Amino acid sequence: KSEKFAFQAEVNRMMKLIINSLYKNKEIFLRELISNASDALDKIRLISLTDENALAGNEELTVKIKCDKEKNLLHVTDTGVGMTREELVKNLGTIAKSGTSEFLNKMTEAQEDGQSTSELIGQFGVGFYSAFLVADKVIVTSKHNNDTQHIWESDSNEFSVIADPRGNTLGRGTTITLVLKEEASDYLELDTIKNLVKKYSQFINFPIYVWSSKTKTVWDWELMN
Numbered sequence: 001k002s003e004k005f006a007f008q009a010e011v012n013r014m015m016k017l018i019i020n021s022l023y024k025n026k027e028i029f030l031r032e033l034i035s036n037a038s039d040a041l042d043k044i045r046l047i048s049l050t051d052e053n054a055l056a057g058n059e060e061l062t063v064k065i066k067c068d069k070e071k072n073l074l075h076v077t078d079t080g081v082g083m084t085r086e087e088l089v090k091n092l093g094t095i096a097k098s099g100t101s102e103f104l105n106k107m108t109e110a111q112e113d114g115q116s117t118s119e120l121i122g123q124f125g126v127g128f129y130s131a132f133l134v135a136d137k138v139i140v141t142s143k144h145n146n147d148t149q150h151i152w153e154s155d156s157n158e159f160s161v162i163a164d165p166r167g168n169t170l171g172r173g174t175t176i177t178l179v180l181k182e183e184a185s186d187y188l189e190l191d192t193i194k195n196l197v198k199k200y201s202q203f204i205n206f207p208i209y210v211w212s213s214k215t216k217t218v219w220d221w222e223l224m225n
């Protein structure tokens with residue numbers, strides 16, 4: 001069932017521009033993933049204004065982050081609109097929106113003339129690729145109301161998508177799972193993550209939680225705002 005895809009040339013070029021723009025500020029990948037989560041939540045929220053049963057799959061509007069130090073994984077899960085199988089392929093593997101092309105041109109000129117680029121990344125919502133600054137593999141699990149749950153996975157050299165054999169476990173939404181590089185093990189530390197989530201979530205309009213422990217050890221979702 002697993003279908004293999006090559007990234008579109010432009011996406012390969014875009015990944016490299018992003019990586020180089022944020023190379024000395026890797027922590028920004030988290031800000032971009034939170035921003036993506038927020039936007040996805042805003043979208044399902046707007047859809048609920050016109051579709052009564054829009055939230056049926058998962059009545060919560062949240063962003064939940066968990067570290068799995070013992071598995072070397074960082075998970076960022078939102079209960080936003082999600083993506084159908086076709087949207088996974090299109091959004092992650094091609095220059096989907098008319099605007100991505102715009103970002104690509106603007107990014108190239110800005111990078112050429114020394115103008116700041118981190119803002120452009122956030123403006124066009126193409127920050128996902130910055131996850132490759134800290135991860136050897138990025139996995140995206142998503143569930144949209146119009147489709148079944150699928151998994152997209154990539155080490156940046158190609159990507160594949162398969163129907164999730166685990167069924168509908170998200171309800172609705174998306175999980176970004178990062179298999180962290182050795183040099184990035186710091187992001188597996190709850191304290192580093194909380195501090196970062198807190199620094200990048202005060203502006204978000206949705207509640208953001210991190211699976212944290214107290215220690216007898218108490219494990220639960222801690223609100224960062």
Ligand SMILES: C[C@@H]1C[C@H]2O[C@@H]2CCCCC(=O)CC2C(Cl)C(=O)CC(=O)C2C(=O)O1
Pocket residue numbers: 033035036037039040041043078080081082083091092125128173174176
């Ligand atoms: C297509 C929808 C909704 C859309 O408004 C957002 C903004 C940016 C999206 C960028 C993407 O490429 C897909 C998603 C990524 Cl990468 C995430 O980290 C979280 C997420 O929830 C995504 C999504 O489901 O996005």
